[model samples]
Target: MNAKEIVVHALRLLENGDARGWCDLFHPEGVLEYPYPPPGYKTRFEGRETIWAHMRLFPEYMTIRFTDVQFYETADPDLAIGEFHGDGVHTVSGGKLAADYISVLRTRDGQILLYRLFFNPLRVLEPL
Candidate 1:
């Protein structure tokens, strides 16, 4: 898949709570970066296994529901930019967790090589 397709697929898998499917889109040594991560979150996850480890617990806290998706193609063939909103419901606290995110993805050989995600963690934390 192209970079944009891969990213869209990843978001679909996340919305469906399919952690394995999402991780499968990554290259074995692909890197996931969170520039504005929360206190307990990792800033960078190197490799598919590392990303999978964190994604596995994703649904344990919230049910992902993505909307307002916008995609942009960059000058770099392998890079794509995406903007979306994640409207999730906190599992334990029953709070509404709404976040706007911008992600840049680079794909190579039909797999994601790099993923950089930016979002406000306090939106979810404060609601909890």
Candidate 2:
């Protein structure tokens, strides 16, 4: 898949709350990062197991969906930028979660190589 197509496919998987399926789209050494993490929260995840370990908790923690995603094309064909809104409910607390995120991604041979996401840390920590 191309850069934009890969990102689109990732969001589709995430919307369905399929964490393992979503993480499967990443390269074995893919890197996922968050610039603003809540206190004591991790900021980076690297490689397959590391990414999968964290991602696999999605279904257990919350039910989420990505909506109104918009992609921005870059000069580099392998890079894609996306903006999206997420809505979900925390499984334990039943607390609502609504947040917007901007993620910059790079695809290498149809798999995700880099994903740097920016979001409001407070909003993300609400359910945690």
Candidate 3:
């Protein structure tokens, strides 16, 4: 898959709340980073296991759907940029989560090499 397909599939798996399937899309040692994490959130997830661990808790907290996904190709075949929104309902608090995000990913051979996501972490956290 190309970079766009890699990201699209990952997001689809996430919307489906399929943590394991989402995690499987990354390379074994792939890194996920949030350069600007919210007050109580961590900024990095290293390795597939760590990513899976975080993703596994997502559905428990909220039912999420990604929308407005726009992908832009880079000069390098392995790199791409995406913009999207995650709209959801917080399961525990019954609040709304509407978060906008921009993500940059490097993918090769159908697996993501590295991912960096930018977003207002407070948006989702505040609702929960």
Alpha-carbon runs more than 4 Å astray in model 2: none
Better of 1 and 3 by TM-score: 1
Q: Deviation in angstroms for 128 in model 2?
A: 12
C-alpha lDDT values of all predictions: 0.88, 0.87, 0.86
lDDT tens readout by residue for model 3, 54-119: 877887887789999997768877788989998889887889988899999999788988989998
The TM-score that candidate 1 achieves is: 0.93
Please give me the total number of clashing residue pairs in predicted model 1: 0
Task: For candidate 2, write residues 41-79 as lDDT tens digits.
Answer: 799999978999888988888888878889876998789
True-structure Cα RMSD, model 1: 1.4
* TM-score for each of the candidates: 0.93, 0.92, 0.92
Worst 10 residues of 2 by lDDT: 119-128
Mind giving the per-residue lDDT tens digits that candidate 1 earns over 1-128?
A: 77887877888998888888989989999999999998897899999999999888887887888988898758876788999998888788788878999999989978998999999989857774
lDDT of 3 at 92: 78
Predicted model with the maximum lDDT:
1
